[PDB]
Amino acid sequence: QTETYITQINPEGKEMYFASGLGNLYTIIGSDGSPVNLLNAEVKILKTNSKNLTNYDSPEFEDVTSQYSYTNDGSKITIDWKTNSISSTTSYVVLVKIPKQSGVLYSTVSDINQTYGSKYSYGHTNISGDSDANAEIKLLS
Amino acid sequence: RQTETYITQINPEGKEMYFASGLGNLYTIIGSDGSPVNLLNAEVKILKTNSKNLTDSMDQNYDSPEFEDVTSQYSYTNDGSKITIDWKTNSISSTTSYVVLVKIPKQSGVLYSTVSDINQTYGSKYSYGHTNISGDSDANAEIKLLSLEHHHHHH
Questions:
Q1: What element of type H or E holds B74?
Q2: Domain-by-domain residue ranges, chain B?
Q3: What CATH number labels A1-141?
Q4: A54 C-beta neighbours (distance < 10 Å), count
Q5: Distances (CA, A) of A5 to A95, A105, B56
Q6: For B76, what's the count of Cα atoms within 13 Å in the CB-facing half-sphere?
Q7: Which of B7, B123, B152 sits opposite A129 (nearest CB)?
Q8: Which residue of A has its CA nearest to B114?
Q9: Contact A6/B at CB under 8 A
Q10: N6-methyllysine-modified residues are where (chain A) (predicted)?
Q11: H-run or E-run covering A67
Q12: Alpha carbon distance A108, A127 (integer Å)
């Protein structure tokens, strides 16, 4: 009934800087397309030392959901990281839980207008049938 | 090196994946959408193991007793745009899972993987990809700013 999408910010502990004129780093979660409804999404934001990344309930993860907060208009969730620079030792984890819906969801580390940065997309569709054919995918180094 | 590995976990939910008569064997097809991702120089490895081992991270020791190399037993066809794997059965038990590792040159774009019939008319399909929004070749384009993953369920 529910699906959870996990977005890790600065998963490899690098210096992430947005040139002056770009504004702060933001993370936008939504669906290019059919669209995925986000009005009933459960959102949690965690902060941790990048050295910890590769269970988000562990003491190594600090719940900062209230400190950063986020906007949600039903089709896009936006998080302001409050800075144009995230140090190599800083990482965040955004958990978005929504009713199981078929479709494509995307997450970014970009400017508020999505004209600069990086965008990852994840999708699942049932070709047809009621079989329990299932898989999980991901791109990793 | 600049390579990334596109990992597909087969049956991470630990359920019996059964294809009724007429659908043929279970297959996994890996390809792209759209610029298409070039798979001509892809390095492919296939592993067999128990579903209870598959993690959301997919960052495991694929060189452990847990995993067995079945790359040759299964084999695969790769025409450069599509990789097709015949699982040789219409029934994969709840305690059987596979992991397909496709190592390719670091590229932007969206790849997809299926657990379907040979013709992709039945089953499930998943897509995953990333892209540089502005297309600028700067410091940020050289690093991974984020990662996205779907939490899998294993009842």
A1: helix B71-74
A2: 1-155
A3: 2.60.40.1290
A4: 10
A5: 6, 9, 11
A6: 25
A7: B123
A8: A135
A9: yes
A10: 100
A11: helix A65-68
A12: 27
Question: What is the rounded CA–CA span in Å between residue B47 and residue B74?
Answer: 10
Asked if residues B68 and B47 have their Cβ atoms less than 8 Å apart, the reply is: yes
In the numeric block, which tokens belong to residue A48? 């941790």
| Tokens found for residue B33 | 């959408």
- Contact indicator for B127, A121 with CB cutoff of 8 Å: yes
Contact predicate A13/A6, CB 8 Å: no
Least Cα separation, residue A124 to chain B (angstroms):
4
Residue with tokens 């495991």: B60
Q: Which two tokens stand for residue A83?
A: 């800075």
Q: Which residue has the tokens 């299964």?
A: B74
| CATH architecture group of domain B1-155 | Sandwich (2.60)
CA A15 to chain centre: 19
- The answer to whether the CB of B90 falls within 8 A of the CB of B99 is no
Question: Under an 8 A CB cutoff, do A135 and B11 touch?
Answer: yes
In Å, what resolution does this model reach? 1.7
What is the spatial distance between Cα B13 and Cα B114, in angstroms, rounded to a whole number? 15
| B67/B10 Cα distance (integer angstroms) | 13
CA distance B67 to B73: 14
Q: Which two tokens stand for residue B13?
A: 């939910």
The first and second tokens of residue B46, run together, are 């296939």
**Residue B60: exposed, middle, or buried by beta-carbon count in 10 A (0-12, 13-18, 19+)?**
middle
CA distance A86 to chain B (A): 10
CA distances from B89 to A32, B74, B121, B122 (A): 37, 11, 17, 15
A46 contacts A56 by C-beta, under 8 angstroms: yes
- Residues of chain B numbered 44-103 and touching chain A (CB < 8 Å): 54, 56-59
B19, two tokens: 């294809």
